[PDB]
Amino acid sequence: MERGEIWLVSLDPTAGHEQQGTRPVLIVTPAAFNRVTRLPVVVPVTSGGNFARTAGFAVSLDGVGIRTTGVVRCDQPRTIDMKARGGKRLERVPETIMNEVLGRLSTILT
Amino acid sequence: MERGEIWLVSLDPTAGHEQQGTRPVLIVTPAAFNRVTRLPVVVPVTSGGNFARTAGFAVSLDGVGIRTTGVVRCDQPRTIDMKARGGKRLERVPETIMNEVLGRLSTILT
RNA sequence: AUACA
């Protein structure tokens, strides 16, 4: 597992109003960290608004030519289980998208 | 965050190696988001028993004079609900300790 | 009451 890779996993079961529904998550933490900690920080992919681009907490996606149709959002993230659920590797996003995600996590730290 | 907000809420339900159980948690999300989506991210507190010590990401709430004698897991935060689940603030953590937690939470930007 | 169980 490397940085910028997209792994399919489920965030459920959810309660109240969490981000429910199986979707591919993006690996935010570097391989070195994931290797020793074995707990990678991931962000959920949801909708945005009009187009699959930057929507506040949602980062831009459509433009690099990917198979995953959606918008990466760093609004409601959480370190879920990737041991019993199992992650399925799909594809990977360019460094362009990686920088986008790394700029939304700072806005939640307050 | 809003600074110094230790709320008690039920982390359940959960599945896999994720945090669960009704215990005090430290919110990370700021007022500009906590009062918007109503879905904040909380850091699970882990009781130390009679004494606690700071280590790595584990922030020690014990020492300065706090009721909650334990360490916060600034490694596995989960997005939950703070309206339907039902939460209540127990005590207010000193600004000194609050800064320590935030400093540990800065490791997720690596 | 920024969400594709």
mmCIF file of all heavy atoms in Angstrom, chain B residues 42-94:
data_model
loop_
_atom_site.group_PDB
_atom_site.id
_atom_site.type_symbol
_atom_site.label_atom_id
_atom_site.label_comp_id
_atom_site.label_asym_id
_atom_site.label_seq_id
_atom_site.Cartn_x
_atom_site.Cartn_y
_atom_site.Cartn_z
ATOM 1 N N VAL B 42 -14.217 12.744 17.215
ATOM 2 C CA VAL B 42 -13.812 12.677 18.609
ATOM 3 C C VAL B 42 -12.629 11.746 18.833
ATOM 4 O O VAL B 42 -12.474 10.730 18.147
ATOM 5 C CB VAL B 42 -14.978 12.253 19.524
ATOM 6 C CG1 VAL B 42 -16.057 13.325 19.552
ATOM 7 C CG2 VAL B 42 -15.556 10.916 19.080
ATOM 8 N N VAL B 43 -11.791 12.129 19.783
ATOM 9 C CA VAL B 43 -10.627 11.351 20.162
ATOM 10 C C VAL B 43 -10.978 10.525 21.396
ATOM 11 O O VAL B 43 -11.321 11.074 22.447
ATOM 12 C CB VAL B 43 -9.418 12.263 20.471
ATOM 13 C CG1 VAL B 43 -8.278 11.471 21.092
ATOM 14 C CG2 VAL B 43 -8.949 12.966 19.207
ATOM 15 N N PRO B 44 -10.916 9.194 21.276
ATOM 16 C CA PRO B 44 -11.251 8.280 22.371
ATOM 17 C C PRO B 44 -10.262 8.343 23.532
ATOM 18 O O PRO B 44 -9.052 8.167 23.350
ATOM 19 C CB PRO B 44 -11.202 6.901 21.707
ATOM 20 C CG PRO B 44 -10.282 7.073 20.548
ATOM 21 C CD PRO B 44 -10.510 8.471 20.056
ATOM 22 N N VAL B 45 -10.784 8.605 24.722
ATOM 23 C CA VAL B 45 -9.961 8.665 25.921
ATOM 24 C C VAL B 45 -9.837 7.265 26.512
ATOM 25 O O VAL B 45 -10.797 6.490 26.503
ATOM 26 C CB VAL B 45 -10.560 9.620 26.977
ATOM 27 C CG1 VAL B 45 -9.646 9.738 28.189
ATOM 28 C CG2 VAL B 45 -10.823 10.990 26.371
ATOM 29 N N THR B 46 -8.647 6.930 26.984
ATOM 30 C CA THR B 46 -8.396 5.631 27.582
ATOM 31 C C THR B 46 -7.916 5.814 29.018
ATOM 32 O O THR B 46 -6.866 6.412 29.255
ATOM 33 C CB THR B 46 -7.339 4.859 26.775
ATOM 34 O OG1 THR B 46 -7.516 5.149 25.382
ATOM 35 C CG2 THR B 46 -7.489 3.362 26.994
ATOM 36 N N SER B 47 -8.711 5.326 29.963
ATOM 37 C CA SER B 47 -8.396 5.429 31.381
ATOM 38 C C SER B 47 -7.037 4.820 31.715
ATOM 39 O O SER B 47 -6.668 3.757 31.201
ATOM 40 C CB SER B 47 -9.493 4.747 32.199
ATOM 41 O OG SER B 47 -10.777 5.172 31.772
ATOM 42 N N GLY B 48 -6.299 5.499 32.583
ATOM 43 C CA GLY B 48 -4.996 5.021 32.986
ATOM 44 C C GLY B 48 -5.042 4.353 34.344
ATOM 45 O O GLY B 48 -4.041 3.818 34.822
ATOM 46 N N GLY B 49 -6.212 4.385 34.967
ATOM 47 C CA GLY B 49 -6.380 3.780 36.269
ATOM 48 C C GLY B 49 -6.216 4.786 37.384
ATOM 49 O O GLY B 49 -7.118 5.582 37.652
ATOM 50 N N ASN B 50 -5.056 4.765 38.022
ATOM 51 C CA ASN B 50 -4.772 5.680 39.118
ATOM 52 C C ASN B 50 -3.775 6.748 38.702
ATOM 53 O O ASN B 50 -3.687 7.800 39.331
ATOM 54 C CB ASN B 50 -4.247 4.919 40.336
ATOM 55 C CG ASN B 50 -5.349 4.540 41.305
ATOM 56 O OD1 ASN B 50 -5.955 3.471 41.195
ATOM 57 N ND2 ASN B 50 -5.621 5.411 42.260
ATOM 58 N N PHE B 51 -3.034 6.482 37.636
ATOM 59 C CA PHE B 51 -2.035 7.423 37.150
ATOM 60 C C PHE B 51 -1.861 7.276 35.643
ATOM 61 O O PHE B 51 -2.015 6.180 35.096
ATOM 62 C CB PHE B 51 -0.700 7.186 37.867
ATOM 63 C CG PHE B 51 0.259 8.344 37.791
ATOM 64 C CD1 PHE B 51 0.133 9.422 38.650
ATOM 65 C CD2 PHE B 51 1.288 8.351 36.864
ATOM 66 C CE1 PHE B 51 1.011 10.486 38.587
ATOM 67 C CE2 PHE B 51 2.171 9.412 36.794
ATOM 68 C CZ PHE B 51 2.032 10.480 37.657
ATOM 69 N N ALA B 52 -1.563 8.379 34.973
ATOM 70 C CA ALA B 52 -1.358 8.369 33.531
ATOM 71 C C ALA B 52 -0.077 9.117 33.174
ATOM 72 O O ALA B 52 0.392 9.955 33.943
ATOM 73 C CB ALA B 52 -2.557 8.976 32.817
ATOM 74 N N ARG B 53 0.494 8.799 32.017
ATOM 75 C CA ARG B 53 1.721 9.440 31.557
ATOM 76 C C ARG B 53 1.656 9.690 30.055
ATOM 77 O O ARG B 53 1.059 8.906 29.315
ATOM 78 C CB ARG B 53 2.940 8.572 31.890
ATOM 79 C CG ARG B 53 3.330 8.599 33.357
ATOM 80 C CD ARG B 53 4.278 7.465 33.706
ATOM 81 N NE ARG B 53 4.381 7.283 35.154
ATOM 82 C CZ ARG B 53 4.115 6.140 35.784
ATOM 83 N NH1 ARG B 53 3.775 5.056 35.092
ATOM 84 N NH2 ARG B 53 4.196 6.086 37.110
ATOM 85 N N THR B 54 2.261 10.786 29.614
ATOM 86 C CA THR B 54 2.272 11.137 28.200
ATOM 87 C C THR B 54 3.317 10.301 27.459
ATOM 88 O O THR B 54 4.417 10.073 27.972
ATOM 89 C CB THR B 54 2.518 12.657 27.987
ATOM 90 O OG1 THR B 54 2.087 13.061 26.678
ATOM 91 C CG2 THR B 54 3.983 13.029 28.180
ATOM 92 N N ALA B 55 2.957 9.813 26.279
ATOM 93 C CA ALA B 55 3.864 8.995 25.486
ATOM 94 C C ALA B 55 3.452 8.984 24.021
ATOM 95 O O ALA B 55 2.372 8.502 23.673
ATOM 96 C CB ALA B 55 3.911 7.574 26.030
ATOM 97 N N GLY B 56 4.313 9.525 23.169
ATOM 98 C CA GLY B 56 4.037 9.563 21.746
ATOM 99 C C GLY B 56 2.812 10.387 21.415
ATOM 100 O O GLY B 56 2.821 11.605 21.556
ATOM 101 N N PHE B 57 1.753 9.719 20.988
ATOM 102 C CA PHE B 57 0.515 10.399 20.636
ATOM 103 C C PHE B 57 -0.436 10.439 21.826
ATOM 104 O O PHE B 57 -1.404 11.198 21.837
ATOM 105 C CB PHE B 57 -0.161 9.722 19.436
ATOM 106 C CG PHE B 57 -0.389 8.244 19.604
ATOM 107 C CD1 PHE B 57 -1.527 7.769 20.236
ATOM 108 C CD2 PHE B 57 0.538 7.329 19.130
ATOM 109 C CE1 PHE B 57 -1.737 6.414 20.392
ATOM 110 C CE2 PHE B 57 0.334 5.971 19.281
ATOM 111 C CZ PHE B 57 -0.804 5.512 19.914
ATOM 112 N N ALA B 58 -0.143 9.633 22.838
ATOM 113 C CA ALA B 58 -0.982 9.569 24.022
ATOM 114 C C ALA B 58 -0.749 10.779 24.918
ATOM 115 O O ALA B 58 0.322 10.928 25.509
ATOM 116 C CB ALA B 58 -0.739 8.273 24.783
ATOM 117 N N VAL B 59 -1.743 11.653 24.983
ATOM 118 C CA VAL B 59 -1.666 12.849 25.813
ATOM 119 C C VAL B 59 -2.160 12.526 27.219
ATOM 120 O O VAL B 59 -3.225 11.928 27.385
ATOM 121 C CB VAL B 59 -2.520 13.994 25.229
ATOM 122 C CG1 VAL B 59 -2.540 15.201 26.157
ATOM 123 C CG2 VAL B 59 -2.019 14.386 23.851
ATOM 124 N N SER B 60 -1.391 12.924 28.218
ATOM 125 C CA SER B 60 -1.751 12.661 29.601
ATOM 126 C C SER B 60 -2.624 13.770 30.161
ATOM 127 O O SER B 60 -2.215 14.932 30.209
ATOM 128 C CB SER B 60 -0.497 12.499 30.467
ATOM 129 O OG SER B 60 -0.818 11.958 31.736
ATOM 130 N N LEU B 61 -3.834 13.411 30.564
ATOM 131 C CA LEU B 61 -4.756 14.368 31.150
ATOM 132 C C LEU B 61 -4.506 14.430 32.651
ATOM 133 O O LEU B 61 -4.891 15.382 33.328
ATOM 134 C CB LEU B 61 -6.207 13.954 30.876
ATOM 135 C CG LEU B 61 -6.581 13.726 29.407
ATOM 136 C CD1 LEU B 61 -7.999 13.187 29.294
ATOM 137 C CD2 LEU B 61 -6.427 15.007 28.601
ATOM 138 N N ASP B 62 -3.834 13.403 33.156
ATOM 139 C CA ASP B 62 -3.518 13.312 34.573
ATOM 140 C C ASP B 62 -2.219 14.043 34.877
ATOM 141 O O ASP B 62 -1.285 14.031 34.075
ATOM 142 C CB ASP B 62 -3.416 11.846 35.004
ATOM 143 C CG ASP B 62 -3.050 11.666 36.467
ATOM 144 O OD1 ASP B 62 -3.480 12.491 37.305
ATOM 145 O OD2 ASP B 62 -2.350 10.683 36.789
ATOM 146 N N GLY B 63 -2.176 14.691 36.030
ATOM 147 C CA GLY B 63 -0.999 15.427 36.426
ATOM 148 C C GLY B 63 -1.335 16.847 36.820
ATOM 149 O O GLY B 63 -1.025 17.281 37.928
ATOM 150 N N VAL B 64 -1.991 17.562 35.915
ATOM 151 C CA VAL B 64 -2.376 18.952 36.154
ATOM 152 C C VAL B 64 -3.548 19.052 37.136
ATOM 153 O O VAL B 64 -3.694 20.048 37.850
ATOM 154 C CB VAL B 64 -2.718 19.676 34.829
ATOM 155 C CG1 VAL B 64 -3.947 19.074 34.163
ATOM 156 C CG2 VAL B 64 -2.881 21.172 35.043
ATOM 157 N N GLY B 65 -4.373 18.015 37.172
ATOM 158 C CA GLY B 65 -5.513 18.004 38.063
ATOM 159 C C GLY B 65 -6.821 17.908 37.308
ATOM 160 O O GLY B 65 -7.598 18.860 37.275
ATOM 161 N N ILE B 66 -7.058 16.755 36.699
ATOM 162 C CA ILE B 66 -8.272 16.519 35.931
ATOM 163 C C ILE B 66 -8.962 15.262 36.460
ATOM 164 O O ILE B 66 -8.294 14.346 36.952
ATOM 165 C CB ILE B 66 -7.943 16.351 34.422
ATOM 166 C CG1 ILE B 66 -7.320 17.637 33.866
ATOM 167 C CG2 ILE B 66 -9.177 15.975 33.614
ATOM 168 C CD1 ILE B 66 -6.987 17.574 32.390
ATOM 169 N N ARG B 67 -10.288 15.229 36.388
ATOM 170 C CA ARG B 67 -11.053 14.080 36.850
ATOM 171 C C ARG B 67 -10.760 12.871 35.968
ATOM 172 O O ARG B 67 -10.450 11.784 36.464
ATOM 173 C CB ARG B 67 -12.550 14.398 36.826
ATOM 174 C CG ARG B 67 -13.466 13.185 36.863
ATOM 175 C CD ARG B 67 -14.773 13.476 36.145
ATOM 176 N NE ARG B 67 -15.895 12.734 36.715
ATOM 177 C CZ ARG B 67 -16.906 13.305 37.368
ATOM 178 N NH1 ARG B 67 -16.941 14.625 37.516
ATOM 179 N NH2 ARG B 67 -17.877 12.553 37.875
ATOM 180 N N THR B 68 -10.864 13.071 34.662
ATOM 181 C CA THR B 68 -10.604 12.012 33.699
ATOM 182 C C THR B 68 -9.119 11.636 33.703
ATOM 183 O O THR B 68 -8.298 12.272 33.043
ATOM 184 C CB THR B 68 -11.036 12.438 32.281
ATOM 185 O OG1 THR B 68 -12.331 13.053 32.347
ATOM 186 C CG2 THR B 68 -11.108 11.231 31.355
ATOM 187 N N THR B 69 -8.783 10.613 34.472
ATOM 188 C CA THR B 69 -7.412 10.146 34.586
ATOM 189 C C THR B 69 -7.091 9.130 33.491
ATOM 190 O O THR B 69 -7.301 7.927 33.656
ATOM 191 C CB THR B 69 -7.187 9.502 35.965
ATOM 192 O OG1 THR B 69 -7.822 10.311 36.968
ATOM 193 C CG2 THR B 69 -5.706 9.377 36.279
ATOM 194 N N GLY B 70 -6.596 9.617 32.364
ATOM 195 C CA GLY B 70 -6.261 8.734 31.270
ATOM 196 C C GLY B 70 -5.533 9.447 30.157
ATOM 197 O O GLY B 70 -5.123 10.601 30.312
ATOM 198 N N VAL B 71 -5.375 8.759 29.038
ATOM 199 C CA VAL B 71 -4.691 9.315 27.881
ATOM 200 C C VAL B 71 -5.596 9.281 26.655
ATOM 201 O O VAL B 71 -6.402 8.363 26.490
ATOM 202 C CB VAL B 71 -3.376 8.558 27.571
ATOM 203 C CG1 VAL B 71 -2.329 8.840 28.639
ATOM 204 C CG2 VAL B 71 -3.621 7.061 27.450
ATOM 205 N N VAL B 72 -5.473 10.285 25.805
ATOM 206 C CA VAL B 72 -6.283 10.355 24.597
ATOM 207 C C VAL B 72 -5.577 9.688 23.421
ATOM 208 O O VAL B 72 -4.372 9.864 23.224
ATOM 209 C CB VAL B 72 -6.666 11.803 24.224
ATOM 210 C CG1 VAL B 72 -7.881 12.259 25.014
ATOM 211 C CG2 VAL B 72 -5.503 12.750 24.451
ATOM 212 N N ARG B 73 -6.331 8.905 22.658
ATOM 213 C CA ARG B 73 -5.789 8.208 21.499
ATOM 214 C C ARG B 73 -5.833 9.104 20.263
ATOM 215 O O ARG B 73 -6.763 9.025 19.458
ATOM 216 C CB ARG B 73 -6.572 6.916 21.235
ATOM 217 C CG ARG B 73 -6.292 5.796 22.225
ATOM 218 C CD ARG B 73 -4.873 5.267 22.082
ATOM 219 N NE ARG B 73 -4.618 4.730 20.749
ATOM 220 C CZ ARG B 73 -4.212 3.483 20.509
ATOM 221 N NH1 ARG B 73 -4.029 2.634 21.512
ATOM 222 N NH2 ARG B 73 -3.994 3.092 19.262
ATOM 223 N N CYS B 74 -4.834 9.968 20.126
ATOM 224 C CA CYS B 74 -4.756 10.886 18.994
ATOM 225 C C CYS B 74 -4.214 10.176 17.754
ATOM 226 O O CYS B 74 -3.338 10.692 17.060
ATOM 227 C CB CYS B 74 -3.861 12.075 19.349
ATOM 228 S SG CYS B 74 -3.950 12.582 21.082
ATOM 229 N N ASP B 75 -4.742 8.990 17.489
ATOM 230 C CA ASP B 75 -4.322 8.192 16.347
ATOM 231 C C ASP B 75 -5.528 7.604 15.619
ATOM 232 O O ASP B 75 -5.519 7.450 14.397
ATOM 233 C CB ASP B 75 -3.380 7.068 16.799
ATOM 234 C CG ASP B 75 -4.079 5.992 17.609
ATOM 235 O OD1 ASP B 75 -4.755 6.330 18.605
ATOM 236 O OD2 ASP B 75 -3.942 4.802 17.263
ATOM 237 N N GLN B 76 -6.577 7.291 16.370
ATOM 238 C CA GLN B 76 -7.777 6.714 15.784
ATOM 239 C C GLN B 76 -9.038 7.507 16.135
ATOM 240 O O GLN B 76 -9.790 7.137 17.041
ATOM 241 C CB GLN B 76 -7.931 5.247 16.191
ATOM 242 C CG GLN B 76 -9.036 4.517 15.448
ATOM 243 C CD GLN B 76 -9.132 3.054 15.822
ATOM 244 O OE1 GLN B 76 -8.814 2.659 16.947
ATOM 245 N NE2 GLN B 76 -9.583 2.241 14.879
ATOM 246 N N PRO B 77 -9.276 8.627 15.438
ATOM 247 C CA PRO B 77 -10.459 9.449 15.655
ATOM 248 C C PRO B 77 -11.613 8.978 14.769
ATOM 249 O O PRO B 77 -11.402 8.555 13.629
ATOM 250 C CB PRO B 77 -9.986 10.833 15.217
ATOM 251 C CG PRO B 77 -8.968 10.573 14.151
ATOM 252 C CD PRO B 77 -8.402 9.194 14.395
ATOM 253 N N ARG B 78 -12.827 9.040 15.290
ATOM 254 C CA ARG B 78 -13.990 8.612 14.528
ATOM 255 C C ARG B 78 -15.038 9.710 14.435
ATOM 256 O O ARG B 78 -15.256 10.457 15.391
ATOM 257 C CB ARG B 78 -14.618 7.346 15.126
ATOM 258 C CG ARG B 78 -15.824 6.832 14.344
ATOM 259 C CD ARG B 78 -16.647 5.839 15.146
ATOM 260 N NE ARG B 78 -17.933 5.546 14.504
ATOM 261 C CZ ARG B 78 -18.782 4.606 14.923
ATOM 262 N NH1 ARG B 78 -18.510 3.895 16.008
ATOM 263 N NH2 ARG B 78 -19.914 4.394 14.265
ATOM 264 N N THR B 79 -15.664 9.810 13.274
ATOM 265 C CA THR B 79 -16.715 10.778 13.051
ATOM 266 C C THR B 79 -18.019 10.207 13.589
ATOM 267 O O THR B 79 -18.449 9.132 13.170
ATOM 268 C CB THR B 79 -16.878 11.038 11.545
ATOM 269 O OG1 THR B 79 -15.901 10.270 10.822
ATOM 270 C CG2 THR B 79 -16.691 12.511 11.236
ATOM 271 N N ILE B 80 -18.632 10.904 14.526
ATOM 272 C CA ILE B 80 -19.873 10.436 15.120
ATOM 273 C C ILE B 80 -20.959 11.500 15.049
ATOM 274 O O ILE B 80 -20.847 12.471 14.302
ATOM 275 C CB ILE B 80 -19.674 10.019 16.594
ATOM 276 C CG1 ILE B 80 -19.049 11.161 17.396
ATOM 277 C CG2 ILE B 80 -18.826 8.759 16.692
ATOM 278 C CD1 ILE B 80 -19.263 11.040 18.887
ATOM 279 N N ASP B 81 -22.004 11.307 15.835
ATOM 280 C CA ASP B 81 -23.120 12.237 15.887
ATOM 281 C C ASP B 81 -23.187 12.850 17.281
ATOM 282 O O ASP B 81 -22.902 12.170 18.272
ATOM 283 C CB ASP B 81 -24.423 11.494 15.569
ATOM 284 C CG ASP B 81 -25.664 12.271 15.957
ATOM 285 O OD1 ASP B 81 -26.024 12.260 17.154
ATOM 286 O OD2 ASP B 81 -26.284 12.890 15.075
ATOM 287 N N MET B 82 -23.554 14.122 17.363
ATOM 288 C CA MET B 82 -23.642 14.798 18.649
ATOM 289 C C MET B 82 -25.008 15.445 18.854
ATOM 290 O O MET B 82 -25.122 16.473 19.522
ATOM 291 C CB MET B 82 -22.534 15.844 18.782
ATOM 292 C CG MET B 82 -22.001 16.004 20.198
ATOM 293 S SD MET B 82 -20.612 17.149 20.299
ATOM 294 C CE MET B 82 -21.452 18.720 20.128
ATOM 295 N N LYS B 83 -26.049 14.839 18.291
ATOM 296 C CA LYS B 83 -27.401 15.374 18.428
ATOM 297 C C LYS B 83 -28.432 14.276 18.694
ATOM 298 O O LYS B 83 -29.312 14.434 19.541
ATOM 299 C CB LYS B 83 -27.792 16.231 17.216
ATOM 300 C CG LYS B 83 -27.571 15.567 15.867
ATOM 301 C CD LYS B 83 -27.922 16.507 14.729
ATOM 302 C CE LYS B 83 -27.968 15.782 13.394
ATOM 303 N NZ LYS B 83 -28.571 16.631 12.332
ATOM 304 N N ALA B 84 -28.314 13.167 17.985
ATOM 305 C CA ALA B 84 -29.232 12.051 18.150
ATOM 306 C C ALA B 84 -28.664 11.043 19.138
ATOM 307 O O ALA B 84 -29.409 10.342 19.822
ATOM 308 C CB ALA B 84 -29.506 11.388 16.810
ATOM 309 N N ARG B 85 -27.338 10.965 19.200
ATOM 310 C CA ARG B 85 -26.667 10.054 20.117
ATOM 311 C C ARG B 85 -26.784 10.554 21.555
ATOM 312 O O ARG B 85 -26.914 9.763 22.490
ATOM 313 C CB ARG B 85 -25.192 9.888 19.737
ATOM 314 C CG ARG B 85 -24.951 9.093 18.460
ATOM 315 C CD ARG B 85 -23.467 8.812 18.261
ATOM 316 N NE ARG B 85 -23.193 8.088 17.014
ATOM 317 C CZ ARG B 85 -22.339 7.067 16.918
ATOM 318 N NH1 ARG B 85 -21.713 6.619 17.997
ATOM 319 N NH2 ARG B 85 -22.119 6.485 15.744
ATOM 320 N N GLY B 86 -26.742 11.871 21.716
ATOM 321 C CA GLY B 86 -26.851 12.463 23.034
ATOM 322 C C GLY B 86 -25.511 12.601 23.727
ATOM 323 O O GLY B 86 -24.934 11.614 24.184
ATOM 324 N N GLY B 87 -25.016 13.828 23.814
ATOM 325 C CA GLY B 87 -23.742 14.067 24.456
ATOM 326 C C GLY B 87 -23.831 15.147 25.513
ATOM 327 O O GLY B 87 -24.767 15.948 25.512
ATOM 328 N N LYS B 88 -22.867 15.157 26.420
ATOM 329 C CA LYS B 88 -22.819 16.151 27.489
ATOM 330 C C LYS B 88 -21.376 16.391 27.914
ATOM 331 O O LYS B 88 -20.606 15.442 28.056
ATOM 332 C CB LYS B 88 -23.652 15.694 28.693
ATOM 333 C CG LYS B 88 -23.363 14.269 29.147
ATOM 334 C CD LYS B 88 -24.051 13.947 30.464
ATOM 335 C CE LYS B 88 -25.558 13.804 30.298
ATOM 336 N NZ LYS B 88 -25.932 12.559 29.571
ATOM 337 N N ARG B 89 -21.007 17.649 28.101
ATOM 338 C CA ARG B 89 -19.652 17.987 28.512
ATOM 339 C C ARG B 89 -19.459 17.713 29.996
ATOM 340 O O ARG B 89 -20.222 18.203 30.829
ATOM 341 C CB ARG B 89 -19.325 19.450 28.195
ATOM 342 C CG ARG B 89 -17.898 19.849 28.538
ATOM 343 C CD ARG B 89 -17.656 21.322 28.274
ATOM 344 N NE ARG B 89 -18.522 22.170 29.090
ATOM 345 C CZ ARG B 89 -18.808 23.437 28.797
ATOM 346 N NH1 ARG B 89 -18.285 24.015 27.720
ATOM 347 N NH2 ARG B 89 -19.628 24.131 29.581
ATOM 348 N N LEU B 90 -18.436 16.935 30.320
ATOM 349 C CA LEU B 90 -18.148 16.588 31.705
ATOM 350 C C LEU B 90 -17.359 17.697 32.389
ATOM 351 O O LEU B 90 -17.847 18.331 33.327
ATOM 352 C CB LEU B 90 -17.377 15.266 31.781
ATOM 353 C CG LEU B 90 -18.064 14.045 31.168
ATOM 354 C CD1 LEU B 90 -17.207 12.804 31.349
ATOM 355 C CD2 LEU B 90 -19.444 13.838 31.774
ATOM 356 N N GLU B 91 -16.149 17.934 31.905
ATOM 357 C CA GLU B 91 -15.292 18.963 32.467
ATOM 358 C C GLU B 91 -14.561 19.706 31.359
ATOM 359 O O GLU B 91 -14.659 19.337 30.187
ATOM 360 C CB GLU B 91 -14.298 18.357 33.464
ATOM 361 C CG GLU B 91 -13.487 17.187 32.920
ATOM 362 C CD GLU B 91 -12.727 16.445 34.004
ATOM 363 O OE1 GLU B 91 -12.591 16.990 35.124
ATOM 364 O OE2 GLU B 91 -12.270 15.312 33.744
ATOM 365 N N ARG B 92 -13.837 20.749 31.727
ATOM 366 C CA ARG B 92 -13.093 21.532 30.755
ATOM 367 C C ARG B 92 -11.594 21.363 30.955
ATOM 368 O O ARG B 92 -11.039 21.746 31.989
ATOM 369 C CB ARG B 92 -13.499 23.006 30.812
ATOM 370 C CG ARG B 92 -12.645 23.916 29.946
ATOM 371 C CD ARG B 92 -13.424 25.137 29.492
ATOM 372 N NE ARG B 92 -14.180 24.879 28.269
ATOM 373 C CZ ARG B 92 -14.331 25.769 27.288
ATOM 374 N NH1 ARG B 92 -13.784 26.977 27.389
ATOM 375 N NH2 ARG B 92 -15.030 25.455 26.205
ATOM 376 N N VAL B 93 -10.950 20.774 29.961
ATOM 377 C CA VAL B 93 -9.516 20.540 30.000
ATOM 378 C C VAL B 93 -8.746 21.859 29.875
ATOM 379 O O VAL B 93 -9.084 22.707 29.042
ATOM 380 C CB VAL B 93 -9.082 19.544 28.894
ATOM 381 C CG1 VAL B 93 -9.453 20.048 27.508
ATOM 382 C CG2 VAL B 93 -7.601 19.221 28.978
ATOM 383 N N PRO B 94 -7.740 22.069 30.744
ATOM 384 C CA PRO B 94 -6.907 23.276 30.724
ATOM 385 C C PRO B 94 -6.296 23.527 29.346
ATOM 386 O O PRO B 94 -5.985 22.581 28.611
ATOM 387 C CB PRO B 94 -5.807 22.965 31.744
ATOM 388 C CG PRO B 94 -6.437 21.995 32.681
ATOM 389 C CD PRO B 94 -7.361 21.159 31.842
#
